[PDB]
Amino acid sequence: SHTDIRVPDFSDYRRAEVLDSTKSSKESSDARKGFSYLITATTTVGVAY
Amino acid sequence: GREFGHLTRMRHVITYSLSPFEQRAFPHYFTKGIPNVLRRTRACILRVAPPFVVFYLVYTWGTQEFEKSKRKNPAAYEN
Amino acid sequence: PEAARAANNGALPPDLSYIVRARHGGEDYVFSLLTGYCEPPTGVSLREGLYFNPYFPGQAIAMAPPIYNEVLEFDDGTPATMSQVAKDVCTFLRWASEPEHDHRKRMGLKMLMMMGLLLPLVYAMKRHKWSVLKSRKLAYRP
Amino acid sequence: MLSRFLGPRYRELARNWIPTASMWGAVGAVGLVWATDWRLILDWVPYIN
Amino acid sequence: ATRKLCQSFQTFNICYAETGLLGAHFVCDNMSIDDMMFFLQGQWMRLCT
Amino acid sequence: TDLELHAPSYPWSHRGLLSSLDHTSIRRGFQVYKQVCSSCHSMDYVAYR
Amino acid sequence: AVAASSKWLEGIRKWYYNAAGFNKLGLMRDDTIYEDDDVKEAIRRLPENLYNDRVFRIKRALDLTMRQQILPKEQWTKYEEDKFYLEPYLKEVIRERKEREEWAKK
Amino acid sequence: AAPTLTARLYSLLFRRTSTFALTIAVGALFFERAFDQGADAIYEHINQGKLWKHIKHKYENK
Amino acid sequence: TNIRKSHPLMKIINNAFIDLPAPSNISSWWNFGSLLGICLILQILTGLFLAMHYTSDTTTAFSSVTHICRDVNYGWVIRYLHANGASMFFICLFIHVGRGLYYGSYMFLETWNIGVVLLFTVMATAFMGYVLPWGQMSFWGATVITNLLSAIPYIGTDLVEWIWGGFSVDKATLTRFFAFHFILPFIITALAAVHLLFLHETGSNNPTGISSDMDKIPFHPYYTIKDILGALFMMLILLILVLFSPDLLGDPDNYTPANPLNTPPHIKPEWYFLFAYAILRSIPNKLGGVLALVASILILILMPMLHTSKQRSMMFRPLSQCLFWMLVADLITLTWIGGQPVEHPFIIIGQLASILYFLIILVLMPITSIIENNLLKW
Amino acid sequence: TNIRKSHPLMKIINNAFIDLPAPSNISSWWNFGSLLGICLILQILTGLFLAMHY
Numbered sequence A: 001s002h003t004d005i006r007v008p009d010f011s012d013y014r015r016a017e018v019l020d021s022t023k024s025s026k027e028s029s030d031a032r033k034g035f036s037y038l039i040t041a042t043t044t045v046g047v048a049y
Numbered sequence B: 001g002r003e004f005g006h007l008t009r010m011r012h013v014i015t016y017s018l019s020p021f022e023q024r025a026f027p028h029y030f031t032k033g034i035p036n037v038l039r040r041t042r043a044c045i046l047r048v049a050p051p052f053v054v055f056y057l058v059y060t061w062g063t064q065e066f067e068k069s070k071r072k073n074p075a076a077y078e079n
Numbered sequence C: 001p002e003a004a005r006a007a008n009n010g011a012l013p014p015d016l017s018y019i020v021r022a023r024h025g026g027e028d029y030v031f032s033l034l035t036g037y038c039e040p041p042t043g044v045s046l047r048e049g050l051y052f053n054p055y056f057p058g059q060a061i062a063m064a065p066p067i068y069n070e071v072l073e074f075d076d077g078t079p080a081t082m083s084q085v086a087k088d089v090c091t092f093l094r095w096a097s098e099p100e101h102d103h104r105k106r107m108g109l110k111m112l113m114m115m116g117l118l119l120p121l122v123y124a125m126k127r128h129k130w131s132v133l134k135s136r137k138l139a140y141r142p
Numbered sequence D: 001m002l003s004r005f006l007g008p009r010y011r012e013l014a015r016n017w018i019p020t021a022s023m024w025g026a027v028g029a030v031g032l033v034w035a036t037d038w039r040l041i042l043d044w045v046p047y048i049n
Numbered sequence E: 001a002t003r004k005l006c007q008s009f010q011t012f013n014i015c016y017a018e019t020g021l022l023g024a025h026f027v028c029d030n031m032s033i034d035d036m037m038f039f040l041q042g043q044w045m046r047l048c049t
Numbered sequence F: 001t002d003l004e005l006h007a008p009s010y011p012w013s014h015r016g017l018l019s020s021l022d023h024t025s026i027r028r029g030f031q032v033y034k035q036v037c038s039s040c041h042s043m044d045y046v047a048y049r
Numbered sequence G: 001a002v003a004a005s006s007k008w009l010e011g012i013r014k015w016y017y018n019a020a021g022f023n024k025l026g027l028m029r030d031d032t033i034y035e036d037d038d039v040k041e042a043i044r045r046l047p048e049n050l051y052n053d054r055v056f057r058i059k060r061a062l063d064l065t066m067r068q069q070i071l072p073k074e075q076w077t078k079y080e081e082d083k084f085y086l087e088p089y090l091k092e093v094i095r096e097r098k099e100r101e102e103w104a105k106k
Numbered sequence H: 001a002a003p004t005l006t007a008r009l010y011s012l013l014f015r016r017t018s019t020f021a022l023t024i025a026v027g028a029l030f031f032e033r034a035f036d037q038g039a040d041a042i043y044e045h046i047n048q049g050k051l052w053k054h055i056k057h058k059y060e061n062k
Numbered sequence I: 001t002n003i004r005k006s007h008p009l010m011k012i013i014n015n016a017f018i019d020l021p022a023p024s025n026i027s028s029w030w031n032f033g034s035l036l037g038i039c040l041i042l043q044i045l046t047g048l049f050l051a052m053h054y055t056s057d058t059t060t061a062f063s064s065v066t067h068i069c070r071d072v073n074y075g076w077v078i079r080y081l082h083a084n085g086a087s088m089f090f091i092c093l094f095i096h097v098g099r100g101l102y103y104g105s106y107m108f109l110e111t112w113n114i115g116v117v118l119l120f121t122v123m124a125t126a127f128m129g130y131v132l133p134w135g136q137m138s139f140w141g142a143t144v145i146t147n148l149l150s151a152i153p154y155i156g157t158d159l160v161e162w163i164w165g166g167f168s169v170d171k172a173t174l175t176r177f178f179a180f181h182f183i184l185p186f187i188i189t190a191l192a193a194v195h196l197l198f199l200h201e202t203g204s205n206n207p208t209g210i211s212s213d214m215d216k217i218p219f220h221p222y223y224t225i226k227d228i229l230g231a232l233f234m235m236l237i238l239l240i241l242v243l244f245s246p247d248l249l250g251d252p253d254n255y256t257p258a259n260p261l262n263t264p265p266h267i268k269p270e271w272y273f274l275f276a277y278a279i280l281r282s283i284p285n286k287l288g289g290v291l292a293l294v295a296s297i298l299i300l301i302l303m304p305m306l307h308t309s310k311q312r313s314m315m316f317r318p319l320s321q322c323l324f325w326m327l328v329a330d331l332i333t334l335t336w337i338g339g340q341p342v343e344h345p346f347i348i349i350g351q352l353a354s355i356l357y358f359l360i361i362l363v364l365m366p367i368t369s370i371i372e373n374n375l376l377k378w
Numbered sequence J: 001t002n003i004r005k006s007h008p009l010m011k012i013i014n015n016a017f018i019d020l021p022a023p024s025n026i027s028s029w030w031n032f033g034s035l036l037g038i039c040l041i042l043q044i045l046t047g048l049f050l051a052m053h054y
């Protein structure tokens, strides 16, 4: 049956602020999606060479 | 005529994915990566390396026999 | 060149504005030949115009030694011995061959500092897109 | 293993095609010397001098 | 309806006590998925501005 | 025609990767070309400019 | 076809199977064949359960090579469990090509 | 669950990708004149007393 | 109504670079095809500068090049960008050919045959660019080509006289070498668009040698960001060789001017021709030596016909991997021998290594694939 | 199996010059577009010569 299908566990890949499965990730998402993101922005100030 | 909806026939296969903003871009790097790049080195070392050893031995024999054919004359240098 | 080699017993001393870029020693060769003169050894019977220099191709340069102690005295005051004469003229003739020397190395320093910024930042941008494929899982349910 | 030339029916392969080529191995001795400025066949005939 | 891109679509608003799901569902043939996803995402962005 | 003698490595003050030339030793070495030589050698590519 | 080297030449066959490493990616021998025109006709003639098994085994091996990883050693394909599922279908496709070629020259 | 300081200005300038289209132009400073700390202070330190603008007071206003 | 799927010019770009299906397990050895396209563009925007300030004659060629490094502004950086940028092109070309030889990419027959034409055209171009500066290596290297080019038994003596400007070393020699060097890089740019149009019919091969139609990904953004990162690492290596050692790949004797003044202490070309100069020099006949020079590059066309394995690539063939690296070590030997004088140990070595280069491709590789076929019970 | 309809390079030439649908009442004023392509090619194989000796 299709109810035998569940997502396998992704705990050894997640960011360290979303391992808790019970907190609803309100403010741990906009203060999370910035890790590789001035990485992209300070790249393009280096392309000014 | 090679576009994405027209490539091949496939049945009964399921894939699961995570968003890039939900995971860390650097997982296990020296915990997994250093044991991985060492057995990859072991798997290919007996195929690639023994040809380049024979180039080294021919190069040393070829530069050393060049000098003692030229002006290196200890004892064959008489009347 | 007609009157050149007649003044030097059948040899023309060459131009020097590219002489350290044109030999297999750089400015180490010019220094080691200006200060390396010897006397002709046993059996080497050299002709009219040959002074025995062991750092020459053919051992038989047509060159009497040009420099010795105090052929010159410098402008600010420096003991003008023979090695000091040759060391300064071999800091000349290298700037002459390569007048871009100090500009080449200062521009190479800003290159290494800008590519020390661009390269770890393009690599982590590549790492961000490819993590979708690296984390995926497959299942077969026939 | 290019034995497609070796067959008992396609021996008449070369018998319908070579009566075209009765001059075609020597058209370089007829046609290229029209532009070489040599004297390859210019001694053969008193046609040309 | 003009291009015959799908069989149907619908938008939903599923609510729970603290969270929910806000989105859309559609049915189409195998050569129309990319165009239907392109036009739907362009209507969400046309309401944000 | 038998062997040759190659020059050794002298530790010049411009030998390093980020090393400049000494700009007092070029002034002293210009006069070793000017007043001790140019009786045999031209240097037809450098000026007084 | 030598009876004295019956076991010795099977030792070199088992050694070469492990030196080649498609069994570390979970592949069978007929998964690795180069697909010319006779091979592509034999794939079209496979039954539906053997076709779907081959498609998943190839996709799982391409995904492992992207990550530069292999399978655990208890999941490697054994030497005396490798099924030559494509070889009866390929011998028949080639026999039909050689029949149409003797007819075209006789 | 207090976060780290990676919420840089993500809610302030970086969400609507208005920054990303023009970082060749707008977000382009702090890396020419702020890098007087860089190569020129390093290059003249390895070559102290060897460049021309080091031996310069000896030969003007004589 | 999607504009990148319906505009007549935008839909060509979309099918070629954006929405193109690509295998997901493509390695870093597949980076060197776009690197060759970067090196070819760079050699065009730098050869602009040099041909602007240039005069090609027997009296002024050696001084026209020394004028640029000193007098012409930003001329030292652009000249050594051009001399090292051609060494970068040749290392990205030998990696590229050895990839397609290892993974069986020559089974794409039309793409492989246009590639062999591209290998001839860049080799002949760079020969006619090293003759332009007119030093000792420019003279004595050009005058060993024409000894084997006048050995053509009928047309050869009027062939070399037609390309030497008219007699010999003169003013107009460097008006036909320079003409055959300005215009040959643009036939390469048109032969590269045709080269990719034939690859687009099948898509790319992958390191396993198995077709990958069940596991394709789009080219953007996965390989657009991976080709940009690999090109940035190439500019770092090139600018290090230009700004820190711009004479490492070169010969000092080509700073000694050209004249028939005196025989040089040695004769040797650049590093990427040393394997070819070593083969013709080990044949004591100027007709047998010019035949084995052309037979060392055009032997690549026989690679589809000599294939006897049931598999495509070399990933699962351990006995064939040993022979591939014996061939790479044989080309390292010929590059070393080709810069050595013609003396006692370097004639028996340089002529046995010329034999083994042809014995591996023609005889040893087809027999070994058959032996591996029997060991896998097919 | 018609090679000018299936070869990847030949089918571009066939759609552009051979099998292209064209109006039947086209005049001599429609000749000058291919004449401009002849004049541009001629100015390239003649500007070769002049920039050589220049």
Ligand code: HEC
Pocket (backbone or CB within 6 Å): C008, C011, C012, C013, C014, C019, C030, C034, C055, C056, C057, C060, C061, C062, C063, C064, C065, C066, C067, C089, F032, F036, F037, F039, F040
């Ligand atoms: C006694 C006259 C004379 C003097 C003065 C002189 N040279 Fe020479 N030198 C010669 C001659 C003659 C040759 C060329 C010999 C030949 O070509 O066989 C030569 C050759 C050379 C060479 C080339 C050596 C080689 O291996 O080819 C260099 C470098 C050189 N001189 C540098 C200098 C420098 C620097 C000075 C100034 C300190 C100087 N010379 C002064 C006579 C002289």
Ligand code: HEM
Pocket (backbone or CB within 6 Å): I029, I030, I031, I032, I033, I034, I036, I037, I040, I096, I097, I100, I103, I105, I106, I108, I111, I112, I115, I116, I118, I119, I188, I192, I195, I199, I203, I204, I205, I206, I300
């Ligand atoms: C100016 C020279 C060349 C250019 C610009 C060029 C460009 C490219 C590009 C962009 C690709 C696709 C990406 C890749 O796989 O790397 C490619 C693939 C290929 N090239 Fe080249 N190439 C050149 C020379 C050659 C040569 C000399 C050969 C062979 C003798 C060759 C044979 C091939 C083959 C067989 C492929 C497909 C490989 C595969 O998908 O496995 N090319 N080339």
Ligand code: HEM
Pocket (backbone or CB within 6 Å): I040, I043, I044, I047, I048, I050, I051, I054, I065, I079, I082, I083, I086, I089, I122, I125, I126, I129, I130, I132, I133, I181, I182, I185, I188
């Ligand atoms: C495939 C592209 C190219 C290759 C492999 C190549 C190779 C070379 C080489 C080896 C030299 C000799 C440099 C030296 O020995 O110092 C050179 C210089 C030269 N090239 Fe190119 N080149 C290419 C493109 C071009 C282009 C596009 C032009 C003209 C527009 C050009 C014109 C010249 C000229 C005039 C010189 C002489 C200047 C000098 O020697 O510094 N080349 N090139």
Ligand code: HEM
Pocket (backbone or CB within 6 Å): J029, J030, J031, J032, J033, J034, J036, J037, J040
């Ligand atoms: C180097 C310059 C040009 C070349 C090679 C060229 C080439 C051509 C060719 C081959 C055609 C199709 C045959 C024909 O109808 O004559 C054509 C048609 C056309 N050209 Fe040009 N042309 C050039 C310049 C121009 C200019 C300057 C204009 C207008 C300002 C223009 C506008 C048109 C138009 C509107 C057509 C279609 C006419 C019709 O079918 O009634 N072209 N061109």
Ligand code: HEM
Pocket (backbone or CB within 6 Å): J040, J043, J044, J045, J047, J048, J050, J051, J054
């Ligand atoms: C659209 C194509 C072209 C046009 C309309 C054009 C136009 C002209 C004109 C008006 C002159 C002056 C002749 C005189 O006054 O005596 C000339 C000559 C010249 N052109 Fe071009 N030309 C074209 C193509 C080229 C090309 C392809 C090149 C270089 C490869 C070139 C380079 C030169 C040079 C160097 C001269 C020297 C002056 C002379 O020899 O008379 N031109 N061309």
Ligand SMILES: COC(=O)N(OC)c1ccccc1COc1ccn(-c2ccc(Cl)cc2)n1
Pocket (backbone or CB within 6 Å): I120, I123, I124, I126, I127, I128, I129, I130, I131, I137, I138, I140, I141, I142, I267, I268, I269, I270, I273, I276, I277, I293
């Ligand atoms: C950068 O230029 C040099 O290295 N050149 O030529 C000025 C040089 C300089 C000195 C000595 C010899 C050479 C040339 O040696 C060779 C050996 C083989 N080729 C060759 C050339 C074209 C083609 Cl298609 C195929 C093979 N050239």
